[PDB]
Amino acid sequence: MREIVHIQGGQCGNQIGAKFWEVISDEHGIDPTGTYHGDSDLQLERINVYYNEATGGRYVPRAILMDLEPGTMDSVRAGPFGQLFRPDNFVFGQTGAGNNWAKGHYTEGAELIDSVLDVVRKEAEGCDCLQGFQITHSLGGGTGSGMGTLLISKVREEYPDRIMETFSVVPSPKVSDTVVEPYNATLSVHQLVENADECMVIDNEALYDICFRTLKLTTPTYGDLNHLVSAAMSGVTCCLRFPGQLNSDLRKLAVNLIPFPRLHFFMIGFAPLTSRGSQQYRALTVPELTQQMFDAKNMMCAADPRHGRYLTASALFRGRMSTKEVDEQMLNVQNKNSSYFVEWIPNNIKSSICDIPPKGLKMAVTFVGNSTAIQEMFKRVAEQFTAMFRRKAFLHWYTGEGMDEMEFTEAESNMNDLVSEYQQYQDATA
Amino acid sequence: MREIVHIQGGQCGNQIGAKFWEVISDEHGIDPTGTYHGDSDLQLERINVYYNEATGGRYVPRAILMDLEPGTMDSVRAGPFGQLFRPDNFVFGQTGAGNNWAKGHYTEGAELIDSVLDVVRKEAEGCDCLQGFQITHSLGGGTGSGMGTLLISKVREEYPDRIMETFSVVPSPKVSDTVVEPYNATLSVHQLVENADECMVIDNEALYDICFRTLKLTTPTYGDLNHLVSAAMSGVTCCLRFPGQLNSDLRKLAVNLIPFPRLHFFMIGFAPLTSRGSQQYRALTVPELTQQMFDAKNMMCAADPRHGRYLTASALFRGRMSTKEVDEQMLNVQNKNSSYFVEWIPNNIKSSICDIPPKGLKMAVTFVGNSTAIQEMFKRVAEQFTAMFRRKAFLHWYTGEGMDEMEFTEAESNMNDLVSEYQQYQDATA
Amino acid sequence: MREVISIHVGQGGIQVGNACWELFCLEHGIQPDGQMPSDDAFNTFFSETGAGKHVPRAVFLDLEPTVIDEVRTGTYRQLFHPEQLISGKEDAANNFARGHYTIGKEIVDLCLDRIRKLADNCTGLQGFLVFNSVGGGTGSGLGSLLLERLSVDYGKKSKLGFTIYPSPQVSTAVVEPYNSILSTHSLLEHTDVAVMLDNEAIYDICRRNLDIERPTYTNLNRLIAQVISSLTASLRFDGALNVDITEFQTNLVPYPRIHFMLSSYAPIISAEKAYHEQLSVAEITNSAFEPANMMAKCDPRHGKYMACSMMYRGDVVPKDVNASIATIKTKRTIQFVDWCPTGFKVGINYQPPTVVPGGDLAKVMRAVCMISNSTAIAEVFSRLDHKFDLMYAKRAFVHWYVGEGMEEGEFSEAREDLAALEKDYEEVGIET
Amino acid sequence: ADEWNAGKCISGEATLKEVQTDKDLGKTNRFGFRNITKDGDENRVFGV
Amino acid sequence: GCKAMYQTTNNDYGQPFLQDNKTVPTYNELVEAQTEVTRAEKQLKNKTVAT
């Protein structure tokens, strides 16, 4: 009933999707063998949203794994919860991308996209009434941003009314990992804005800061960073799988958060997060949930939310709490801090309540906010691109595969167009 | 009552027939020594279709083995299930045809066929009420290609109102094992189209592709290919040998599949087929069975359905299932692929339901399709034929045994006429 | 004293006949072996053997032995007469010419001899009930032949045909529009009453009321059997307003050429959602006129009504029917033809319907079955006419028919008869 | 210088739960529209 | 994994009656016994999970 199909691509996307199915299965009580072993009945009413039933009584997720190199998928199949995935859903190349956007979108991706698009269609027609797609990928690589944006563009043609979700791990200057990040990142934004309906940017810089300072663990790893993304992603669609006071699926979030069609880039956050040695001293109440919710350091992005004005924010409350107290906190924040909220839209905060909290927790909140402060991330990416593009450095590989510098100029202008248009609503007055 | 006799010629035909008899004996519960040890009443309910009862209570197949070389004959005699056949039915020459259609159709075939026609007449007059003939042969080998078609001509001359079936393996371009192959292929087709009521075409390359992609077998062999062909063959007479909701026989299939007298060349396929690794991840349902059925990669032929339009198609379903589901699936696929279906005949799909699934499976499907895309094989064969015939290469072997170039010209003209008239209805519109 | 003979031909007719005889045995308590453990209502369908068992008054006819051998090996072997199960060797195989010119000629002699051996035993014969699916070889081939022979051998005996016409958009065969029209020519002037029983309507009924998303043919056949029992229920059961078979064509047929009608049934509910509604007479009669509840895929709102013969079985009170019928006339969406002021022929019976053990239906105090004649039935003849013209324009599938002994020009008369029938419906429907 | 799958994988294993027919033919497994009556009244006529 | 965590709202609609009709406490004792009720409310969490 209103199912959603999940597609993960690239090295980073597979790692994000590897831990996502670990969290969901534990929430629904599914072992590595796919046999239900839960305790409460509520875990089975809407289990078909994410899982398909197979003959013999085991549940197989509707997940599609795609890459140009078999290195990462051979690692994910041998790990725990790696037997759930249908063996026919693995699609791979044999050449790799090498952080070359043209290779993953024009030369190599163009000849493999036909095979993966077929299995995408097969899962979609299997569902009774499709709700939409959710994609996990990274914008700093070839195979990630190459076929990732290609696949969304193709999917939009055959499903023009279904929704689309993307969780983009975009690069940050402080945590540098590739010398050609600005090139392929600004190219993907050009094509991503035209097709996707919901995009939620994530920076490794923010995840490293929240682990070291908030969670206060000495030696973090990619497993811990992937864990924080999994909890936030599952909290977005939690109300679609469990009963609650106010139901709000992904379509309802898009309507209330998107004032204009080109402004669909959000930044997310999850609460509560506490250290291992200080969880006894805190109190789990709505007032303390919301104060950490609005913390600038709790966001999953390098952008500082106090440098701009919020356009519209969404809060998904999990657990049992009084509805009056939830709204009273929301109204109180908007009044005491009138300088940080856009004024020509009255009551620009959305509240949703669901009855089922995450396993091992009493209360939780997932925060999604469309804020004008996100322009800073596009500003810094633009500076690095134009500085390096002026000397035409590292360019002949992008132009050596049938692509021309004309597309480069168009992409930077369009991303410049987005930044200027995105800012001018911050200065707008009634 | 309404029984059929089986006759096989050539090495490939003999292998196909041996594996078919093994499959039929396993399905009917007949041991290799000819004694009945079945477990269900329906196993013995209609055993008279394929077997004869002799003194002592043992069953012998009504199969007639013909050849010009005793090597494969002795091999199949010493192989497993080689004791079922009556020793008298073995008729063979002592010289061989040497892959020469002229040698197999004029020199030794004319002098040898008297005895095999005598035994065929004996079986046909011995059976209570003949239903038809089915013949397994290949169009590449000289002895099969010639003697089989001469025997088809004689049998049609002597029994006008019965049905004739031929399961023929036509030449493939990529997998070639003979150099004079197009010549005797065209010569066989010219005689076959005139007399054979039905013709079913198989490709070794198509079988290799199926077993390597769908089945994911590392080392396929002729045993596996013959097993696939035998299952697809037994699927046709399943409904004649077992009860069902909508029973259908060979004459029913012929009437519902053949619009025009010379358009009687079909392609077949079998479902379900899954690898051992993905065996437990699949769910057996009518929608997925029809999806695999209409998948072009499941066809036993290299011809691509997307290169033509279907005239008529048939789907024999085995197992207990609802009729409304099958009818709705057929209507849905016909409406979804309306551009791929000829438009001047409404509802060009025939469905039959049988209540006995194959041993080991809860459900199974056999597909017989008459589509305009089959002209490609004749096009390629005629191209090779004319390329070799423009230089008169290898022609002295055929001209030194009674034939002349006018017969070759007539055969080429007839093949071209078949191709043109078969393509006419593809673009014919109402 | 009153008897009817049942003729079953073709797989479609046989596979619904055995379901009907299952229902008839339950109504009279006759065990499947034929004996009765512990007044003569059964006499209309059964005949006493003299000591013990009761045998059905029906003859099974087919050219293929698959279905007949299923009955002979089934648990109903001991019920039917061993030599009343006539079977052939070669199938007709969707070919009308085979069943009417080649193979059906050698079997019709055997069936008429048995029917003669069955009519002399009966003394107050009422008529014939013949079951056949039109869109088939032996169903249309033999069915046409039996109708022709019976009409001259017996004459004035009323013949009722329960035919199953092909569905509008879904079908099993591909050439059935050909042999549907060919049999249409035969049955027009040789059967008194014909009933439309396509499969699409019955599929929708199971999906909405009984909520059966994947029904098999047996569910369809059980529902058909209930209608037949209701129609005959006034013959073998005492009632307040009894109706005889001869009192159908006098009250349902305006003109001799107009005798095609479609049926409806109500209530059709499961045994768990029956607790939540009272099944009053006022609402069961309203569900009968629901266009989605018609047994034929036709929308009655597209045409007028000529007459309606609707029967209640159970504990209905005569005053209740008049109150319900008066509301129908006051309704505007249901309009009758101008030259027929009263159009309701209503009968009341004291025999509530029975239910087979393990069946889908639930047992209730009231049920209504309808046979209605309306002008809206003109659509179905047009849609098959459209399909036939598409294929015949290029003579597809014709070489199979001309080669079996039938003239090529016979298709002209068959097509021209349907056009004549359409001209009658459009002519009668206009006002005066 | 080939496991048990040598064309036998067309019909292999298929434990007893797989082979049994579908999940429901000609019956509704929905709670509200099912056919079974409760224990209290194994047979009662469904009207007024 | 706690079983009490899965209890949800909209189950708060009518559900029996904890206190039966035949053992209604008098008004006098309800006033008198508020000392333990307040005492139980304050330290219930302190002796169960705080230890």
Ligand SMILES: Nc1nc2c(ncn2[C@@H]2O[C@H](COP(=O)(O)OP(=O)(O)OP(=O)(O)O)[C@@H](O)[C@H]2O)c(=O)[nH]1
């Ligand atoms: N309602 C219903 N219709 C059936 C059933 N079985 C077959 N039919 C109808 O019969 C039509 C095809 O004819 P068949 O009954 O299969 O075969 P036949 O009537 O015996 O005629 P032949 O082809 O000569 O065997 C189909 O289009 C169905 O609509 C059934 O069990 N119930």
Ligand SMILES: Nc1nc2c(ncn2[C@@H]2O[C@H](COP(=O)(O)OP(=O)(O)O)[C@@H](O)[C@H]2O)c(=O)[nH]1
């Ligand atoms: N959160 C997270 N990020 C990762 C992981 N692996 C790689 N990344 C990020 O992905 C970026 C490099 O992406 P890349 O591997 O080139 O993407 P690809 O081209 O699709 O393979 C780096 O900046 C990393 O921060 C992971 O396991 N978890």
Ligand SMILES: Nc1nc2c(ncn2[C@@H]2O[C@H](COP(=O)(O)OP(=O)(O)O)[C@@H](O)[C@H]2O)c(=O)[nH]1
């Ligand atoms: N499927 C299948 N094809 C075979 C087999 N043996 C031979 N063939 C095919 O038959 C063709 C040669 O035919 P040939 O044996 O000369 O026919 P013959 O002269 O009548 O015996 C080759 O192209 C093979 O592909 C077999 O066991 N199975």
Ligand SMILES: [Mg+2]
């Ligand atoms: Mg039949």
